[PDB]
Amino acid sequence: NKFIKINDKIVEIDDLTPTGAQILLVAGVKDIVEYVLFQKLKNGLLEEIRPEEKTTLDKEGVETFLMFNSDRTYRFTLNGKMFDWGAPSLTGATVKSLAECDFDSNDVWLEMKNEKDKLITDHEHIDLTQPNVERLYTQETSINIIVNAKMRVVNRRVISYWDVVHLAYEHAENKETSIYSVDYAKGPISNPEGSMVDGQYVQLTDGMIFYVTQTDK
Amino acid sequence: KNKFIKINDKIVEIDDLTPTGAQILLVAGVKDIVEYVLFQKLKNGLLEEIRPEEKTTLDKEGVETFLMFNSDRTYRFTLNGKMFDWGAPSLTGATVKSLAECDFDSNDVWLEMKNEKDKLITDHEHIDLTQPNVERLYTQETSINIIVNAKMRVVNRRVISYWDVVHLAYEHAENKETSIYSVDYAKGPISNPEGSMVDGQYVQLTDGMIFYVTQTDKS
Numbered sequence A: 001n002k003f004i005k006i007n008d009k010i011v012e013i014d015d016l017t018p019t020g021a022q023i024l025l026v027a028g029v030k031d032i033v034e035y036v037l038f039q040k041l042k043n044g045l046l047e048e049i050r051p052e053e054k055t056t057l058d059k060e061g062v063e064t065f066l067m068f069n070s071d072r073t074y075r076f077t078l079n080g081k082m083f084d085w086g087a088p089s090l091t092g093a094t095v096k097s098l099a100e101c102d103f104d105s106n107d108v109w110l111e112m113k114n115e116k117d118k119l120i121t122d123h124e125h126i127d128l129t130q131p132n133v134e135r136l137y138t139q140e141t142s143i144n145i146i147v148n149a150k151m152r153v154v155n156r157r158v159i160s161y162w163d164v165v166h167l168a169y170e171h172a173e174n175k176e177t178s179i180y181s182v183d184y185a186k187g188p189i190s191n192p193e194g195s196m197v198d199g200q201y202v203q204l205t206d207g208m209i210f211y212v213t214q215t216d217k
Numbered sequence B: 001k002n003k004f005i006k007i008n009d010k011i012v013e014i015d016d017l018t019p020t021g022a023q024i025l026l027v028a029g030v031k032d033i034v035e036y037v038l039f040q041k042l043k044n045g046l047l048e049e050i051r052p053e054e055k056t057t058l059d060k061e062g063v064e065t066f067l068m069f070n071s072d073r074t075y076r077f078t079l080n081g082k083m084f085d086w087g088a089p090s091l092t093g094a095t096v097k098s099l100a101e102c103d104f105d106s107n108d109v110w111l112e113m114k115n116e117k118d119k120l121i122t123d124h125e126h127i128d129l130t131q132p133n134v135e136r137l138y139t140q141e142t143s144i145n146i147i148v149n150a151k152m153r154v155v156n157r158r159v160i161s162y163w164d165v166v167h168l169a170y171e172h173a174e175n176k177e178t179s180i181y182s183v184d185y186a187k188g189p190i191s192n193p194e195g196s197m198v199d200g201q202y203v204q205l206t207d208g209m210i211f212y213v214t215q216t217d218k219s
């Protein structure tokens, strides 16, 4: 009753010392040569498993693999550690998962030699086809914003309308007889100035300014 | 002690028999360890990547062989059924022969093509590994049908000499004082479609190439 996980699918296997080729076959791949297989080790590193190479699986537990349909791999580093990757890009969210950091309270950053390090938001893609080895790191989010003239430190990069309102009025979401407006400026390039209504979100940056009003409905 | 290794055909001295990949890159002169991909070329012919933290056991004698690519990516190909990683977007026919450990002169390099006939890769042509799938390469004995003095000959080399051609027509032929063997050819490949050969020259062959060999007076 043995399973492994491949790209987050559970996959049943009946060999505890399968080769890479045997794993690609169980995974439903037609042409195994066209795939690159990695085992995701307990320390968080990815080890490539060539078709002729064996891995050893415990009788209990679920080893984890990544399988890419790719004729090449790209390298990057993540908090100093070297990774190979079977796709030309990956998202900030996938980098967080590889880093094993607190997902919501960190950002992903790409080292840049000639400009400031680049913030990679969760859904943005890091282009590994750029010519050097991309150097990525996670860092705890701590963002200083002004809400109704008061300094607020926020540990999340993207927050909601009601999140903003609550930075100005502690007990405001339940106030069915109140209408709250939200304006902002000095935001980042993805939202520099504007207004927010319920259902919207905003990406924060240091020094961003918010003005929140409460009126009777 | 007096230990040497070979990195991309440069012989370099090392003072450690179990270096890490980083230490190998550092004696090779690299400033930025992360930007290179390091392979050891094993005795079984395979390229084994060495990560910066991994050690390699070297013998006190002999010169182990490493390839060191300045590359942020690796391409895969197969060669006679074995998997290769490669730190550059192309490699030549000649480099494939070297990796294959085949006899250079009696083999051709072929690229598998799923629909067309397989492609012949000459010694100086580049195989583009940036094409979308895993390139499948193999070496095979050369076999070319030529005509020498109206007899079909199968030759197992792509390049042959004046005396090879003469001796395909007449085994006894040799250098004389009174006569010489003339060689004229036609229906050759692009490098040499038609002409004459004298001692010292070579020609590239192709199927159907025709040679005419005659013993003439030295006039």
Ligand SMILES: [Ca+2]
Residues within 6 Å of the ligand: A074, A075, A127, A128, A129, A130, A131, A132, A133, A134, B072
């Ligand atoms: Ca890159």
Ligand SMILES: [Ca+2]
Residues within 6 Å of the ligand: A071, B075, B076, B128, B129, B130, B131, B132, B133, B134, B135
């Ligand atoms: Ca390719």
